[PDB]
Structures are given as structure tokens and as C-alpha cells.
Amino acid sequence: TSLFTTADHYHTPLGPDGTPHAFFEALRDEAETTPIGWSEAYGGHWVVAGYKEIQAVIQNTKAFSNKGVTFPRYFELMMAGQDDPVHKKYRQLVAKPFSPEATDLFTEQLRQSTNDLIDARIELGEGDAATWLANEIPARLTAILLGLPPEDGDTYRRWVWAITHVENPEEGAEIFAELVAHARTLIAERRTNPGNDIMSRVIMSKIDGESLSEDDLIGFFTILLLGGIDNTARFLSSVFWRLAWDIELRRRLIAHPELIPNAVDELLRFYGPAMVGRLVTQEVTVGDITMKPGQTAMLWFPIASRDRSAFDSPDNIVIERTPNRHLSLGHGIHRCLGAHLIRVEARVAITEFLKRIPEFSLDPNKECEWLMGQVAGMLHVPIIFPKGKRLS
Numbered sequence: 001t002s003l004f005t006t007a008d009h010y011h012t013p014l015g016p017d018g019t020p021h022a023f024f025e026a027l028r029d030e031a032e033t034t035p036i037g038w039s040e041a042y043g044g045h046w047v048v049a050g051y052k053e054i055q056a057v058i059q060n061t062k063a064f065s066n067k068g069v070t071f072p073r074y075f076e077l078m079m080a081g082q083d084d085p086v087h088k089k090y091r092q093l094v095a096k097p098f099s100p101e102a103t104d105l106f107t108e109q110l111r112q113s114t115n116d117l118i119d120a121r122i123e124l125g126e127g128d129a130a131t132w133l134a135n136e137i138p139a140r141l142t143a144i145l146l147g148l149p150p151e152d153g154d155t156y157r158r159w160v161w162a163i164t165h166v167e168n169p170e171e172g173a174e175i176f177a178e179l180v181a182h183a184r185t186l187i188a189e190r191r192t193n194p195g196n197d198i199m200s201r202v203i204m205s206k207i208d209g210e211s212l213s214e215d216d217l218i219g220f221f222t223i224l225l226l227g228g229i230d231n232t233a234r235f236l237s238s239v240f241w242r243l244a245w246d247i248e249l250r251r252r253l254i255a256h257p258e259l260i261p262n263a264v265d266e267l268l269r270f271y272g273p274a275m276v277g278r279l280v281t282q283e284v285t286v287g288d289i290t291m292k293p294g295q296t297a298m299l300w301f302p303i304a305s306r307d308r309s310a311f312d313s314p315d316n317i318v319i320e321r322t323p324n325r326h327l328s329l330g331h332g333i334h335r336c337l338g339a340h341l342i343r344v345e346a347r348v349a350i351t352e353f354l355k356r357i358p359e360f361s362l363d364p365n366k367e368c369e370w371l372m373g374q375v376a377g378m379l380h381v382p383i384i385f386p387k388g389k390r391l392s
């Protein structure tokens, strides 16, 4: 028997600790023999698990297409769901607006908003770190980047959750219509009165004589919400969970805050939420396997992140690991636009949380829960801590 035959990113067996990592470790071991396997799930598809094999797929932009990023398919994501030439036109237009120098101007606002969120429950001595913090931080960050009051993020959070959970397509269309109406109002304001926020920057961007249309700008807003918020939330939730029980990791980050950036990269390797599809467009051989047009290949980044040929001691969080060429933020032409942003955001989140609440643990009377799928990680992380004080 092979673990590939029933591999299913929405149904990953969970271990006693609550995560899929025992299963991932077992699949990584099998991938040393069979780095690309056939799963019978979703009508049949390739599971690409070896690090070299994922790299070979993801570097191939001739035989694979990002029209297949979402799988199963039951609307185009700007850049993430597109191929060249349109992908490249959009990426060039947003490159400088979303540069590290530009997004770094928002760091101190992010730090303030993170402390404001912590204030909400610090006096209570309990909370769900995923619902209270991890889900809220990226949504408030989005609002901050757009020049809006941070609490406007609460609406973004609600939309993203609703869009991804409603069963009725008419209801889904109503929610998406709210989101689009907001984007149009924001765009009109930023066009008439440009500022220094990311939307103003994207509006003014011009490349080879051309600018983004209103539809393209709505698309950009949409991918910030639908491509950024859940990935970040699930990653941060997993990190908060790990810090709640891993007292040795925790004490080291408190004693050596200069190690937090390298630790963020190591936590990305270990808890990276994403698994992404590719549609096969031309016949192509990768290793021992020949893929055929119309098939789907799923890139199981978490397995590649544990490949012993790529990482020594892959099952350990070695916070000093460097370099760290993990695939959790992709690789090549679709590499995460948010890659710098989320590294800074995770540093701030960890730093402020451990500064405000250095003593905490998982709540023994409530359950954690791991969310499976293409964006995976802890969904509920109930913690307890000694009651503390609001900064405001």
C-alpha cells in the first residue's frame, strides 16, 4: 500500500497532537522512493512531494498553468491564478507599489494595532489565540495598508470567512457584491485624493505606458483579501499554538529577540499553510512520471519542506538554520507577493505577544482544531494566561 493512493489535502490524518505532521513525516519517508504519486482522490491527480520535483514543476511555465491553482474546482485570482503575459503585466505594475520599502512604512501602525488587539482579552486570562489575534492581525494590516482605520479589517475578515463557507452560490454572490462595492468606493477616493497608502501607489503605477483599470484594481483588492488574510491567519494560529506548548522554543525567543527573524523563516518551513495546484497543459515528464494534458498536479509544499536531501534534521525547528530555502512562499515567477510583508508581520506579532503575555499555555478544558485544505493550519487555539493589563 501507498500513502499516495488516498492522499487528500482536505482529509489529512491528524495525530494525537492535533496536526497532520505525523502523516506528513510518513509521506515524506515514502517520497524518498516515490516523490510523485498518484492519488485517486478528486477523480485522480498527481501529488508532488519531493523538493526537487516541486522545483521542477514550479519552474516549468510551459507545460503547467496556474489556471489550475484551486483544486478541486467546484472567477480568476489576480496573478495567482493567471499565466503570462497577463500575470507578468500585473506583477510588474504592483512590484514597486508593494515593495519592502513601501510596506515597511506601516510597521509601527501594525505594532500598535497588534497591541490594541491584545488589549481586548489580556484582562480576562483566556482567549482563542486564533480568533482573537491570528484572524484579526492580517485583516487589520490590510486596512492599514489601504489607508483605512484598522477596525475596517473586521469587515474584511467577515467577508473572507463567509465567501469561503457559504453553500448557496447566490449568497456567495451577495457577499462578493458587498466586497466589490467597497473596493469601488475606496478606489474612487484614492484616485481623486491620492496618498501614500498601497492603493494610491498601485493606482499611480505605470509600466510601458499603461496603468491598471478599475476592474484590475478591484482584482488587486480582492487578492489582498482572498490571497493574504487566510494564509496569514492560519500560519500565525499555528505559530501561537506551537509557542503555547513549546516552552523551550518560547524561552529562546524571549532571551534572544535578534533570532526572531530567522525563527520566523524556520516556522514558515514547518507550518507553511499552502498547497497549490497546477494544471498540466502539455505532456511532460518529471522524474519517473509522465503527466498528460488536463491532469492536475498538487504541490505538497509541507512534504518538500521536510525533504532530508534539502534540509538536515528536517523534523526539528532549528531556529538558527541558515540558509533556509523552503518553498512555503513559493518559488519562481509566482513567488508570494507578500513574502516580505508576512515575515515582518510575523516578527511583530510574535514580539508583541511574547512581550505582553510571556506566560501562557493551551487551555485544558477547550479543544484546539486544525483546518485542512489548500490553506491549512490551526483554526482554534484556546489559551490561558495570568490576567494582565491593557496598554490603553
Ligand code: HEM
Pocket (backbone or CB within 6 Å): 058, 066, 069, 078, 079, 080, 081, 087, 091, 223, 224, 227, 228, 229, 231, 232, 235, 272, 273, 274, 276, 327, 328, 329, 330, 331, 333, 334, 335, 336, 337, 338, 339, 341, 342
Ligand atoms: C503566511 C502567509 C502567506 C503564505 C504562506 C503565502 C503563500 C504563497 C504561495 C505558496 C504562493 C505561490 C503560489 C503559486 O506558486 O501558485 C503565493 C503567491 C501569492 N501571494 Fe502569498 N502567501 C501568504 C501571504 C500573502 C499576503 C499577505 C499577500 C498580500 C500581498 C499575498 C499575495 C500573494 C499573491 C498576489 C501571490 C501570487 C503572485 C504571483 O502570481 O506572481 N500572499 N503565496
Ligand SMILES: [Cl-]
Pocket (backbone or CB within 6 Å): 347, 348, 351
Ligand atoms: Cl519587531
